Amino acid sequence: PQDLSEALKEATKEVHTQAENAEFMRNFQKGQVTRDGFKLVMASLYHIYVALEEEIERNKESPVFAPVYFPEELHRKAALEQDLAFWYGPRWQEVIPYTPAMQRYVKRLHEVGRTEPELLVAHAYTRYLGDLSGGQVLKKIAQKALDLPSSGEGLAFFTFPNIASATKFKQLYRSRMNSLEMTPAVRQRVIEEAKTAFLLNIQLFEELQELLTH
Ligand code: HEM
Numbered sequence: 632p633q634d635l636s637e638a639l640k641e642a643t644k645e646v647h648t649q650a651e652n653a654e655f656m657r658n659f660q661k662g663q664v665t666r667d668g669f670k671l672v673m674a675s676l677y678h679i680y681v682a683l684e685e686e687i688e689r690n691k692e693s694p695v696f697a698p699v700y701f702p703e704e705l706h707r708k709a710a711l712e713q714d715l716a717f718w719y720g721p722r723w724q725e726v727i728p729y730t731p732a733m734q735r736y737v738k739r740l741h742e743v744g745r746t747e748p749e750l751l752v753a754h755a756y757t758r759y760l761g762d763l764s765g766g767q768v769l770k771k772i773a774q775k776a777l778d779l780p781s782s783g784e785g786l787a788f789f790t791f792p793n794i795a796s797a798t799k800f801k802q803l804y805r806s807r808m809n810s811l812e813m814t815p816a817v818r819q820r821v822i823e824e825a826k827t828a829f830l831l832n833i834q835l836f837e838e839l840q841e842l843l844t845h
């Protein structure tokens with residue numbers, strides 16, 4: 632529809648369905664993730680969020696992004712650093728995997744942030760609004776699958792401490808997406824970039840599934 636938030640949701644419905652059908656996601660939802668698989672996911676998220684959040688910081692003052700700049704509410708890099716120190720130990724930064732599908736996603740994030748920051752909102756939407764949607768249900772499926780020690784670390788990623796109500800925040804973020812001023816041409820490019828963002832996630836999950844069969 633007219634609102635960017637509605638147009639994004641409509642335009643990405645098909646690719647979101649593709650994501651729901653992905654082998655890795657079917658497995659994840661059914662509690663079939665192993666510690667190895669979960670670690671790969673966390674490492675992937677770290678690389679992705681490092682790049683996204685670097686680009687957000689670069690562009691935070693620009694009219695094409697400032698309205699959707701919510702650093703305290705949304706930032707995930709620090710939580711992922713905490714979790715990776717648990718999952719991979721003190722040398723995590725040296726030992727975490729960085730695979731081609733992770734690299735392709737990072738590469739696109741930097742291209743967008745450096746050369747077409749007007750499309751960064753498509754990437755922030757796809758990452759943050761999705762990741763905020765797996766409330767306690769996704770954390771618990773993982774928690775049951777992983778059988779973690781009682782050491783109070785490893786799942787920080789699944790809690791956004793600065794957002795009390797996901798619905799409340801999501802409605803605000805949608806409004807801010809809708810506040811963005813763009814030409815019809817740019818709006819179309821933003822929609823296409825959200826599809827690209829979903830496709831980069833789908834390709835990532837396909838690669839991770841392939842790595843886990845070896
Ligand atoms: C396990 C597979 C998945 C399931 C079962 C699932 C399910 C859902 C559900 C039920 C919502 C609620 C929509 C809302 O009210 O906001 C949602 C939102 C969302 N999902 Fe997923 N999802 C999956 C994978 C993905 C993936 C891989 C992405 C890519 C980043 C993604 C991106 C999003 C986004 C951006 C939203 C917010 C939509 C909006 O409100 O505009 N999802 N998802």
Ligand SMILES: O=C(Cn1ccnc1)[C@]12C[C@H]3C[C@H](C[C@H](C3)C1)C2
Pocket residue numbers: 659672676760761762763764765769
């Ligand atoms: O499905 C999600 C987030 N999510 C929830 C609803 N739509 C997207 C992920 C986010 C993040 C942690 C786990 C595995 C993978 C990467 C996908 C659940």
